[PDB]
Symmetry: C2
Subunit: 115 residues, 2 copies
C-alpha cells in the first residue's frame, strides 16, 4: 500500500510531507530547511540541529503555522507527526484518501508522485 | 516548558482478550507481538511461510468499534507494542483518524483514543 504523503509549500518551495500518526514530533531534514531558507529560524537550544518554533506552511491552500525540529541525517524531507496533527485538528481520512484540515481536503499523493 | 501529546491507542478485544492497539499511519504493516498472540490464543493460526518473524495471520476477528472486523497482521517476538494497526489495515477498512474529535472512526462508529492514563 502507498504510504501517506501530502504536498505543501514552505516559502514557495514544494515539499512532500510524510504523514505519521505514530510519530511524536514533526521533523524536517537539514537539506530541506536550507532549500526553504529556514536555517536562520532554527533555535539551537547530536543530530538535532534545533527547533523551529513557528513558520507558515502552505497546506490545503491555507498558511498554517508549523513547529518542527531540524535534523541533518533524515531520509524524509518533512515528517508531520502527531504533535502538529493534533494542534490543527487534522483528519487522516483513508476512506476518501485525503488529509482534512478545517473542511479542506488534501488528496494523498499517488505512488508515482512519491519521493 | 515541555508538552507531549498522547500517542494514539484504541481498545479492542481479540478472542475476548482486551488489546490496546497502537494506531500508526506511518507503519506499512500491522504487527502483533508474540506475547499478545499467545495470550489471545492465536499461535495456531500463524502461517509458517514467513527478533525472528514468527509468521503472518491472514484473517482473525477483531472486535473494534463494536464490529467483528477481519484483521491481518504479522507476529514478531521482540516488539514492545502489543498490536500495531498499520496503514494496510487502516486503508483496508476505510478508517478515519479524527484528531479534531479524538477518535478512530469506522462506518461512522467512533472509538475514542485512550487517555494517557489508560496507555500501556
Amino acid at each position: 500500500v502507498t504510504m501517506l504523503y501530502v504536498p505543501c509549500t514552505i516559502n514557495q518551495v514544494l515539499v512532500k510531507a510524510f504523514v505519521d500518526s505514530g510519530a511524536q514530533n514533526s521533523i524536517m531534514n537539514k537539506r530541506t530547511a536550507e532549500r526553504c531558507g529556514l536555517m536562520r529560524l532554527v533555535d539551537v537550544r547530536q543530530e538535532i540541529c534545533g527547533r523551529i518554533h513557528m513558520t507558515p506552511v502552505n497546506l490545503a491552500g491555507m498558511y498554517i503555522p508549523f513547529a518542527f525540529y531540524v535534523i541533518e541525517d533524515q531520509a524524509m524531507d518533512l515528517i508531520i507527526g502527531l504533535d502538529q496533527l493534533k494542534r490543527h485538528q487534522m483528519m487522516i481520512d483513508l476512506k476518501h484518501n485525503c488529509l482534512t484540515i478545517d473542511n479542506i481536503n488534501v488528496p494523498f499523493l499517488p505512488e508515482n508522485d512519491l519521493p
